[PDB]
Design an enzyme around this catalytic site. Structure first.
Site, PDB file in Angstrom:
ATOM      1  N   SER A  13     -38.301   4.685 -20.134  1.00  0.00           N
ATOM      2  CA  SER A  13     -39.343   5.691 -19.970  1.00  0.00           C
ATOM      3  C   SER A  13     -40.355   5.299 -18.876  1.00  0.00           C
ATOM      4  O   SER A  13     -41.061   4.297 -19.014  1.00  0.00           O
ATOM      5  CB  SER A  13     -40.056   5.934 -21.316  1.00  0.00           C
ATOM      6  OG  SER A  13     -41.117   6.872 -21.167  1.00  0.00           O
TER       7      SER A  13
ATOM      8  N   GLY B 112     -37.853   5.896 -30.167  1.00  0.00           N
ATOM      9  CA  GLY B 112     -38.331   6.033 -31.539  1.00  0.00           C
ATOM     10  C   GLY B 112     -39.265   4.920 -32.000  1.00  0.00           C
ATOM     11  O   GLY B 112     -39.762   4.940 -33.134  1.00  0.00           O
TER      12      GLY B 112
ATOM     13  N   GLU C 284     -30.923   0.240 -19.057  1.00  0.00           N
ATOM     14  CA  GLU C 284     -31.503   1.186 -20.026  1.00  0.00           C
ATOM     15  C   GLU C 284     -31.901   0.557 -21.357  1.00  0.00           C
ATOM     16  O   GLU C 284     -31.048   0.341 -22.212  1.00  0.00           O
ATOM     17  CB  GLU C 284     -30.540   2.342 -20.327  1.00  0.00           C
ATOM     18  CG  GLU C 284     -30.430   3.397 -19.249  1.00  0.00           C
ATOM     19  CD  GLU C 284     -29.468   4.531 -19.628  1.00  0.00           C
ATOM     20  OE1 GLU C 284     -29.859   5.700 -19.429  1.00  0.00           O
ATOM     21  OE2 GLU C 284     -28.339   4.258 -20.112  1.00  0.00           O
TER      22      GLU C 284
ATOM     23  N   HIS D  87     -24.055   5.574 -18.611  1.00  0.00           N
ATOM     24  CA  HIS D  87     -25.365   5.943 -19.114  1.00  0.00           C
ATOM     25  C   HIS D  87     -25.288   6.183 -20.607  1.00  0.00           C
ATOM     26  O   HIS D  87     -24.199   6.308 -21.175  1.00  0.00           O
ATOM     27  CB  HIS D  87     -25.980   7.146 -18.367  1.00  0.00           C
ATOM     28  CG  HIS D  87     -25.011   8.242 -18.051  1.00  0.00           C
ATOM     29  ND1 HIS D  87     -24.913   9.387 -18.802  1.00  0.00           N
ATOM     30  CD2 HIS D  87     -24.109   8.370 -17.054  1.00  0.00           C
ATOM     31  CE1 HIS D  87     -23.990  10.178 -18.284  1.00  0.00           C
ATOM     32  NE2 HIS D  87     -23.485   9.580 -17.223  1.00  0.00           N
TER      33      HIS D  87
ATOM     34  N   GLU E 246     -25.878   8.545 -22.970  1.00  0.00           N
ATOM     35  CA  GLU E 246     -25.129   9.630 -23.602  1.00  0.00           C
ATOM     36  C   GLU E 246     -23.640   9.264 -23.753  1.00  0.00           C
ATOM     37  O   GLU E 246     -22.979   9.642 -24.724  1.00  0.00           O
ATOM     38  CB  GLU E 246     -25.252  10.900 -22.765  1.00  0.00           C
ATOM     39  CG  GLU E 246     -24.477  12.098 -23.349  1.00  0.00           C
ATOM     40  CD  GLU E 246     -24.735  13.357 -22.591  1.00  0.00           C
ATOM     41  OE1 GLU E 246     -24.941  13.279 -21.360  1.00  0.00           O
ATOM     42  OE2 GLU E 246     -24.733  14.432 -23.215  1.00  0.00           O
TER      43      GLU E 246
ATOM     44  N   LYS F 154     -30.638  16.269 -17.036  1.00  0.00           N
ATOM     45  CA  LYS F 154     -29.828  16.254 -18.247  1.00  0.00           C
ATOM     46  C   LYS F 154     -29.726  17.590 -18.948  1.00  0.00           C
ATOM     47  O   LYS F 154     -28.666  17.940 -19.474  1.00  0.00           O
ATOM     48  CB  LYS F 154     -30.322  15.167 -19.208  1.00  0.00           C
ATOM     49  CG  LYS F 154     -29.770  13.767 -18.901  1.00  0.00           C
ATOM     50  CD  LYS F 154     -28.240  13.785 -18.795  1.00  0.00           C
ATOM     51  CE  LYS F 154     -27.626  12.509 -19.332  1.00  0.00           C
ATOM     52  NZ  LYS F 154     -27.957  12.299 -20.782  1.00  0.00           N
TER      53      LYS F 154
ATOM     54  N   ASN G 239     -31.766  11.802 -13.222  1.00  0.00           N
ATOM     55  CA  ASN G 239     -30.644  12.116 -14.066  1.00  0.00           C
ATOM     56  C   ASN G 239     -30.920  13.415 -14.825  1.00  0.00           C
ATOM     57  O   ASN G 239     -31.227  13.401 -16.022  1.00  0.00           O
ATOM     58  CB  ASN G 239     -30.396  10.952 -15.008  1.00  0.00           C
ATOM     59  CG  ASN G 239     -28.940  10.828 -15.434  1.00  0.00           C
ATOM     60  OD1 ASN G 239     -28.072  11.601 -15.022  1.00  0.00           O
ATOM     61  ND2 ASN G 239     -28.673   9.837 -16.271  1.00  0.00           N
TER      62      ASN G 239
END
Lengths: 241, 241, 241
Positions: free
Chosen positions: B204, B164, B158, B86, B88, B12, B10
């Protein structure tokens, strides 16, 4: 002979650092014929090129105006050129012949110089439809314009059909498409308008092939969308004499 | 055993120069198992990857279609894959379960292969709502689909909740989320459909952990959104055997 | 004396690789005064900065919310700051005083801290209209706000008129524009609100000139849109003591 040629960079991306060095390169370039150079971009690069780019032959151009307000605020910012109907707009965003015609006319009406793009796909080329398709695209453009408006209009031909073929266009193929567009304008708009019209080649171009492409009767420059991010865009400018 | 795995990049962002070297890397990669590789991007990179990327196992994919016209013009351009829902799209643009379900179905209807994304936030995970939230997301998707449509559908999970945290998911955590999705499809759509369904891990991933992640029963590949811009995406592809 | 200063990076672009090194640079920076640092970006960088950026003085910020859903989903993602009315928004997208006022108020109502931008063009400056134009911009903002709302509002002054001039603003010019804005808020909103208000300088700033700019009575920091992509953004932060 030909009208004033145009060398157009359609900056599509690129770092601020490499753009910056490109701006120095352009600023330090001595160009010895009449040619209008254009750098088209989204806002972030536009303010950059407006900030540091200073050459008597360069102008900056927008790649899209979202609405009436976006036309006006862009004019208010100092941007007098706009590229419309380019492939991202037709193929990713799905803008129709009519949507691009209406954008062309509205930009003309706001004081912009307009580079308007046309070009056929692979299915269309292979099935023998190039002429009908391309002339239908420019016909939709012409329908929304007055004769006078053409003074602010530039046509770019984008052979989209060649992406993924492995192939680059011959000068012959390019001239045929350009001649076809020139015939249409002459008959439908005017012999005069046709003669002043800049038709730019918008397919894959490098330093080498630009000179041979420009030798062709109906080519008035280039809309470049890869090498325009590279030093060799200088070479493309210099092909226009 | 498993269906055909999928390795999805993907893209980006990234320079045209590094993308170009990545395309050569992919072109020169010999891949020795059945796996569908995907490179998803915005238009500027898509025309690039369409121009020079040529590998029997790679396909290109869009990241968004704005409207009916944008679906059709994309199909007309040669793009047969699209990534939808996705993060975003859900988190920056605020697309609801219903908005993404309607996009999935409309893309299916246009001839696309669809990677459809789902996944819970941190508040949801921590408060014990993973199952309800994730299954509600795929439920909204299923509501707009016919049984047949699933042949063109791929699910990506996802784990947005982990951004974070400093933390990466264990194979166990990933398998649990994937198993949960697999149970739902089996009961609600069909045991058959569930068995052919590709559920990709979309958190990740690196070269190391991809092999161990892929050993898990319900993982059918990866949607990668960082290493897909790096050489080690090769390593991720090779984890799918 | 002054309220808490703000150092804002308006990341506009940049590679993931250089952003990554910038994040390490910021993480390893020791800052010895009270100052709120902000990194504003589009989603791709935001998830990146959320992933690896960890400094007690940094926060991340959005650059736009498209709708009600996009405000809410952004809050749900962990983003509590948003930059609004910045120049790309007024000049490329054509957002009016009213459109930006309505965005400011709606973001305030969703729990965001808002950096709201104002500033005059060159025609306006040269024709002696700075005060009317700038105060009309902040007036439209104030009209949609309650007194309380100002606790979540930061003003940034962008001297857009200076792009392409070759010129940078003197501390004097900057102070005049900031003083003008401070006078308006004091009279119209409150002496109290005016005193707590952060007015950031949003024109071309470097390490050198930031310290001298910050010495001025009505400057409470910077919105930086070039050097914020460079190491010297550290130098700009350190100018705020």
């Amino acid at each position: 002979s030909k009208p004033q040629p145009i060398a157009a960079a359609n900056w599509k991306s690129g770092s601020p650092d490499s753009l910056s060095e490109l701006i120095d390169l352009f600023n330090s370039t001595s160009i010895n014929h009449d040619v209008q150079c254009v750098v088209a971009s989204t806002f972030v690069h536009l303010a950059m090129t407006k900030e540091r780019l200073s050459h008597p032959k360069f102008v900056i151009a927008a790649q899209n105006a979202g609405n009436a307000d976006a036309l006006a605020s862009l004019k208010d910012f100092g941007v007098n050129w706009i590229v419309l109907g380019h492939s991202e707009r037709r193929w990713y965003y799905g803008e129709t012949n009519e949507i691009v015609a209406d954008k062309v006319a509205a930009a003309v009406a706001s004081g912009f110089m307009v580079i308007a793009c046309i070009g056929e796909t692979l299915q269309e080329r292979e099935s023998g439809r190039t002429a009908v398709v391309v002339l239908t695209q420019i016909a939709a453009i012409a329908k929304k314009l007055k004769k006078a408006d053409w003074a602010k209009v530039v046509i770019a031909y984008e052979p989209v059909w060649a992406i993924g073929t492995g192939k680059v266009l011959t000068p012959q193929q390019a001239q045929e498409a350009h001649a076809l567009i020139r015939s249409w304008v002459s008959s439908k708009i005017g012999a005069d308008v046709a003669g002043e019209l800049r038709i730019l080649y918008g397919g894959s171009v490098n330093g080498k092939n630009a000179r041979t492409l420009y030798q062709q009767r109906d080519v008035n420059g280039f809309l470049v969308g890869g090498a325009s991010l590279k030093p060799e865009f200088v070479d493309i400018i210099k092909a226009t004499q």
